[PDB]
Design a protein around this ligand. Structure first.
Ligand SMILES: Cc1ccc(Cc2cc(O)c(O)c(C(=O)NC/C=C/[C@H]3O[C@@H](n4cnc5c(N)ncnc54)[C@H](O)[C@@H]3O)c2)cc1
Ligand SMILES: [Cl-]
Ligand SMILES: [Cl-]
Ligand SMILES: [Mg+2]
Length: 216
């Protein structure tokens, strides 16, 4: 009957407070610590996401991979008024669970969910959705999409000097082609944020890669 993702949403609805994003996040973290593991970024990596958002105060943020809306809630709740999160999610079941999670949280007006493959959607952003340049991108979808989408974002002109890329899972499962590129290119300046895989004692980390402009 129910899926794991419907079980996570259900647990939130019964146990957290509506319109309160912090109870929504703590509820998801509790469910995933005691009942079923799921691929949410988690609290430890979440605090690194908090700080990054706090440091740069981004007006437009793009999230690749929504899943259950845990990072969406995590970032949306910290945005200054007027700022927006676009999130791209290729699975409609996840897209639907994400929407409802944001509604419960009362953050639905700060988020625009686009249901489709990011490689089809990134090229449409300027024309269809009015975009100039992104101030921040958060990558947490399929690990083989990080590099081709980072290059498609450049190709398309969605990046600007000072745009922050924040990439989950750079140690485990790992994102080798992406990590070696951004660390090797003069078009980015990178910092590694060592941490733990969500709900586990296994060493993971995030990578922050700030776009310096096109290479000469
Ligand atoms: C060793 C080891 C292996 C695996 C793990 C476990 C583990 C730990 C983690 O933190 C992880 O982030 C992952 C992981 O694979 N995440 C993939 C995330 C997919 C979501 O994004 C969606 N999506 C996938 N491609 C696209 C796309 N083009 N455009 C739009 N949405 C897309 C999907 O529809 C899902 O909503 C796995 C831990 C340790
Ligand atoms: Cl998440
Ligand atoms: Cl955690
Ligand atoms: Mg992840």
């Amino acid at each position: 009957g129910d899926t794991k993702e419907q079980r996570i949403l259900r647990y939130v609805q019964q146990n957290a407070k509506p319109g309160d994003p912090q109870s929504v996040l703590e509820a998801i973290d509790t469910y995933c610590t005691q009942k079923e593991w799921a691929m949410n970024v988690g609290d430890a990596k979440g605090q690194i996401m908090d700080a990054v958002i706090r440091e740069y105060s981004p007006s437009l943020v793009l999230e690749l991979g929504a899943y259950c809306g845990y990072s969406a809630v995590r970032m949306a709740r910290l945005l200054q008024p007027g700022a927006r999160l676009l999130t791209m999610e290729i699975n409609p079941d996840c897209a639907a669970i994400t929407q409802q999670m944001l509604n419960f949280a009362g953050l639905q007006d700060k988020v625009t969910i686009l249901n489709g493959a990011s490689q089809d959607l990134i090229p449409q952003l300027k024309k269809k959705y009015d975009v100039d340049t992104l101030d921040m991108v958060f990558l947490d979808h399929w690990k083989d999409r990080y590099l081709p989408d980072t290059l498609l974002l450049e190709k398309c002109g969605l990046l600007r000097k000072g745009t922050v890329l924040l990439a989950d899972n750079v140690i485990v499962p790992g994102t080798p082609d992406f990590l070696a590129y951004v660390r090797g290119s003069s078009s980015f300046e990178c910092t590694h944020y060592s941490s733990y895989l969500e709900y586990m004692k296994v060493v993971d980390g995030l990578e922050k890669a700030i776009y310096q402009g096109p290479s000469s």
